[PDB]
Amino acid sequence: GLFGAIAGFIEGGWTGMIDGWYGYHHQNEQGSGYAADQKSTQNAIDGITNKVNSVIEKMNTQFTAVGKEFNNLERRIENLNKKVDDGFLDIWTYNAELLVLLENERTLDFHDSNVRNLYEKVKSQLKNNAKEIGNGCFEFYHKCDDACMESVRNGTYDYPKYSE
Amino acid sequence: GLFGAIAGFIEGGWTGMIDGWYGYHHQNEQGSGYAADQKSTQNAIDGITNKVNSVIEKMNTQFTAVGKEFNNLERRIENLNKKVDDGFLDIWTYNAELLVLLENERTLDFHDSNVRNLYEKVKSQLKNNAKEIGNGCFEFYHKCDDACMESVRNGTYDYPKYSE
């Protein structure tokens, strides 16, 4: 991955998290569970939706009858016609194949970037109140209950509140 | 943003800085003010100038009279001519539209990346002689005068000269 998170230092995905593309897994004394980050998921969705629609809707054509008919003394213009059809076919096939190859790469780089940005957002919030395991997990140096876990997910986490 | 700086952990731009795309805001006892990073600005400018010129100048065209005239027993080749003109219209319209959408995304990613690279360049030279506040600001653990700030902007900053 271009940004090093997906299939990167975060080795795999979570089938447990069903409600979003990106999110959190928490473990504390009250229990464990998955929660999706709604802001980053919904932005990614908005983004990809606009991409797909751009590729689809920018294609506009006029009413056209492709086929043409020529007698046996018209062979030259018949082959001209064939050269036009085949030329358009070569261009559209090549371009469509590459557009999908190239834009598929970018879409995966996009998801990878979103995951990395989310990770570093949490990292910057926790600072030294938590330890970095490396698999995308932070181990707290203090007790963190559901309300604490939520402040982290909410981006509202209170750093000075823990010197414990 | 793909690189997480613009509209990222740096939330907004500076209308105060008129002389460059990316730069610094400094605060000390002598005063405050904006200073643009000249190297990173000019490098970005050279790049974007080259991108635009490529899109514009790579288009080479020959003197062409597009229109053609056909009588009422020439309907087939008249429609062949129309199929060619329209086919060219569909191709250029599609490619032009997607080229701009895709490359606009890349230009914005380019700007985001440049801001981040500048931030981490400053961060790596200052190290622990300053505190990382967030929103792109470093709070110094020593006194930094106008002469000191310029060394930071110039990338010549002297770390061992300050232990406090």
Add this chain to the structure above:
Amino acid sequence: GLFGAIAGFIEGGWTGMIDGWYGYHHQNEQGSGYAADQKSTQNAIDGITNKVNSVIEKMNTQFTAVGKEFNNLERRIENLNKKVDDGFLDIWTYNAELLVLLENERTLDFHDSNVRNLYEKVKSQLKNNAKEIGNGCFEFYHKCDDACMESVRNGTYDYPKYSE
């Protein structure tokens, strides 16, 4: 560089390292030398190879006789034929020129990304057992022999085995 490593905080390349694209230079009491990382090099190679084969092999090529012959009362369809050939010329020249420009940018950004990802991979392994000099170099806070250096390159480096 988009990812800030190549011509970045790592200023130059190694003519000394002949066996791979990305790798390591180590110095300890036993000696110094270059070693290439084979996993990341080979991955990059697989990728770039796939990119190249895509650009070349996605091009459909059918047997075609491009030329046409017209008598002196056929000038209009002769010019129609010319409009088709020139029209295909404009499209293919423009698209190929931009495809190479754009994908060259992406290929360099890819290498830059790979270098950065590898650097951060080593860094997370070493943690506080070493000092980050910059220029891509880590100075150990302990003694590291050839067997130890190999563990870093192998990604098997043992953190708790080294204190001090």
Add this chain to the structure above:
Amino acid sequence: DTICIGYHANNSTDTVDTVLEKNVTVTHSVNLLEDSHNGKLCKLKGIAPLQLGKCNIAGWLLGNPECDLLLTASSWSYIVETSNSENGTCYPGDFIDYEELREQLSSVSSFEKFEIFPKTSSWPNHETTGVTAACSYAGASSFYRNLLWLTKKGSSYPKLSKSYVNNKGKEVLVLWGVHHPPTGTEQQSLYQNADAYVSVGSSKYNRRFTPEIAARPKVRGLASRMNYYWTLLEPGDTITFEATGNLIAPWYAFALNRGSGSGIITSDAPVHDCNTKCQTPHGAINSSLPFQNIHPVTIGECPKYVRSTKLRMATGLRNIP
């Protein structure tokens, strides 16, 4: 106490290709390539196609006896020929500018056949009853329904002159033919005049025909030939026929408003009451996606044809459960 950052995974087996890597499994994806069709020939612009059945366009216009049971509407958005359209010009010869006529008739909005030169009052001094085994109706010698074979009545073929004025407020399609006996003997037997000629004229069209008498290989048992000609008579214009022999005269003609930019589809697929924006010879297809691999030949507002068997776009991310 730990919190982890991660990403979605599921049981999806969808794969896409990327420039760096083939066959990557992703959580979600969408198809950009229209890969299916409905197996029917449908209406284009709310209008059904012309179906010619056993007959091709020439047979239909001339009134080939095999075309009698065809039901023609007053409008069509395109024309359908099948692999069963064999019944054309049953009298051997050349149909002039035939491909052009087919093209220019591919769509029309108010089409009517009418009797331009009525059989009963038009030719008192010529025989109108001529038939041939080459044009057969249920095993019996017959002739085109829309034309009349004029031969001599008794010993003579008097010079004929006939004009039609187009008062229909639209274009009128007029077809006729010229017969070419193999021998001077047959010429006199039919038209009596060895020196015979045909002239047709309008405000635009002007042409003169003479019989070409020559020995030829037999086609459908005939060494004779019959050539077919047509013109579109503009509103208000007049067309005039003169002949001393060999004219295969208009009986019925067609009044119409030509549409434009349509064409002819050759398909054995059944015609149905559905509507579509894109018609293919295999069947109709959805026009919403940008690309289609169904068929290189289409009529409508259509996705671009590509050689691709697969174009699939990643929406979600790498699936790594």
Add this chain to the structure above:
Amino acid sequence: DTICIGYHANNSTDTVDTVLEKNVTVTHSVNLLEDSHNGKLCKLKGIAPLQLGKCNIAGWLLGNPECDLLLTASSWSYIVETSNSENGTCYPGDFIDYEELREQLSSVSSFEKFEIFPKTSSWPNHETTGVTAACSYAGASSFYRNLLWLTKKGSSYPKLSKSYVNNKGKEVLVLWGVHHPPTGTEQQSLYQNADAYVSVGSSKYNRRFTPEIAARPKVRGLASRMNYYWTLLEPGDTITFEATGNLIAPWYAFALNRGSGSGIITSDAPVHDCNTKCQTPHGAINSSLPFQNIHPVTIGECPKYVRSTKLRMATGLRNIP
């Protein structure tokens, strides 16, 4: 004491579209789409177009009496016809290969009209004075300025033979016509000979014409027709006319150097002394940008035509004041 890293902002309202997001406000941008024109027809390659005004190309070449006030330079980069160009062949008939000739004249250098067969000395034994109400000038019957109508002198029309050799060091465009009376009565009245013919030949062109006497609808009051023919006579070559009647003789012809790759524009926009690299029927446009939405049918070195209403490229960054 603090130092901050940040980026530029301004008052720019410029918006662009991106693949992930529509309508993004940015600090700087450039337009790739040329959406305006100057409303004029301008010079291409430093040369003004041929303007035909009231007349179309046929009227101009034949010398239709209404085209007397048009003016032709010795060169032009293209040809402009208007919606007012109606004055063509005023004597009804067919102009053969007319579209081809129009194309071959679309740009020329070194163009000159000259008198190929002077009216006064060329036809001592024939009447040259023929006119018609069909080609009228200022309320009086007239004829094409560049052609001459030869009729019988007294009771006799002797066979004529006339030749021209091209010494002009460039191509010579020669136009002529063949007249077709409605009745043999008229044939004898004008050309005196029932068996009359016209023959034209050169190193390339070979044809013999016969008058076709037939009933035809009246066009501009005439049941007669006059067909128009042309050839490009190569430098050094000879062209020979022989007739016993029905020839409409060349009087003036044109020597020229044909250009190539230009065309014909139909526009009512005023012609001016401005220069352009790209001309559209609406007006001239800048050729600098890669794309233009003004018009698909153009002449020049032109941006590619697209359906886009906006193509705008981000240069600066996301504007967040």
Add this chain to the structure above:
Amino acid sequence: DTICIGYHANNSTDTVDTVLEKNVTVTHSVNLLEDSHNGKLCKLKGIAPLQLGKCNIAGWLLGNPECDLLLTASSWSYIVETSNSENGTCYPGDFIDYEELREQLSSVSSFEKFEIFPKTSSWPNHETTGVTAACSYAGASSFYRNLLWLTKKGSSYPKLSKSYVNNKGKEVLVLWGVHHPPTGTEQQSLYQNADAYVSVGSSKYNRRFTPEIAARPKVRGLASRMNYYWTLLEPGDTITFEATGNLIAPWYAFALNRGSGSGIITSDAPVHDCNTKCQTPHGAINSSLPFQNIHPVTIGECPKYVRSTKLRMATGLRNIP
């Protein structure tokens, strides 16, 4: 106490362009643009082209006396005309649908010349000995090898009727000609019938020719003209000739099986024993790369033609030694 992360560098001088920066030195790269050719005309897909020597295709087909070769090869993938192919129709006149024939003969998988109407037994009632100074072999008047000039025997030219049935199991190319005297005097001298005509017909082809008598400039010393015609006769079909004069009769014809989709290259480059998938007039080119700047008009499976002088794709990374 140190380990460092870095990247490869070398002595490579290769440069690429990127959208952000020109002239970037990289460690590795590959070329996408085929900029060279082998300077030869080669076999296309393992079959040699037809070489016509002194003659062009018309001269070769008609048997111009200067085209005497070892033999027409029995198959070819395409056709080569040179700057030395000068010997065409040595009797001046028009070759009808000549470009069409050239296209349709551009590749064949079997070709044989045969005597369709043997000179010795075919024309007992006509003179076969006609020659002309316009077609000369070794300083003496001669004629086309593949055609026969039929003139009147004694005072009489009886109507001739001659048929050929195609038993060859493939197409037969039949060529013939029609002679056009400048004067009726010459018409009577050769043909005696002034009303003479030629008729050619098959199940498909039907056409009638009459001589067009006109005064014309001399070409190769002749004011006379000769026009050339052809048809492809299908296996099993019959072609029949009837003439009262002016027929230049088939002597030899060609039996053949057409390939499809080839063309003509005009080059003086020598034909060689090399093989290629793409032939250019400059030389053969390699088909592996997607683009080529050698020449726009090619024959084969060819890279797309572009104006680029350089297309080079970075594979390795920025080279910073």
